[PDB]
Amino acid sequence: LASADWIAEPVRLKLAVKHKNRINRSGELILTSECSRYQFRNLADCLQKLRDMIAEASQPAKEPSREDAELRRSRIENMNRERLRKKRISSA
């Protein structure tokens, strides 16, 4: 990802921020497909998936948001752990 010079600098770092789960230890971005039996279609799917990753990360104004069922409980469990965090006394 670091040495991929066919993408812009703001686009290169936004890929690392959003897709940090797919980044290998050595900085190698890994994309995998399993849809079709023919490897021509599998490679075509990876390229189309890579285009979508770059296209949405390229646009600075592209920042979509969404609400999910797991998002509700994630917000609640995050809010609940902040209740105990509110105390402020000298630490170790």
């Binding site: 980044i23 290998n24 230890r25 890994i30």
Partner: protein, 74 residues
């Protein structure tokens, strides 16, 4: 037979299992829904020393919900 654990109930009062497992039959106590006027009236008139008993059909699950497998080691 009243439905029990992991056993549904159709509109025609048929009992169907909801989970894969072993069918078991059991005698348990009966606590009717308060919105059922006829059933709650029967419970009201019972003497203090008595409790309703009914038969139930259970299905103890056998297969676990799922297992964790290694899909990728980055």
């Amino acid at each position: 037979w009243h439905p029990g654990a992991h056993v549904g109930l159709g509109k025609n009062k048929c009992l169907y299992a909801l989970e894969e497992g072993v069918v078991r039959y059991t005698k348990e106590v009966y606590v009717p829904n308060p919105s059922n006027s006829e059933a709650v009236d029967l419970v009201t008139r019972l003497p203090q020393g008595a409790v309703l008993y009914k038969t139930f059909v259970h299905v103890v699950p056998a297969k676990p919900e799922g297992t964790f497998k290694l899909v990728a080691m980055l």
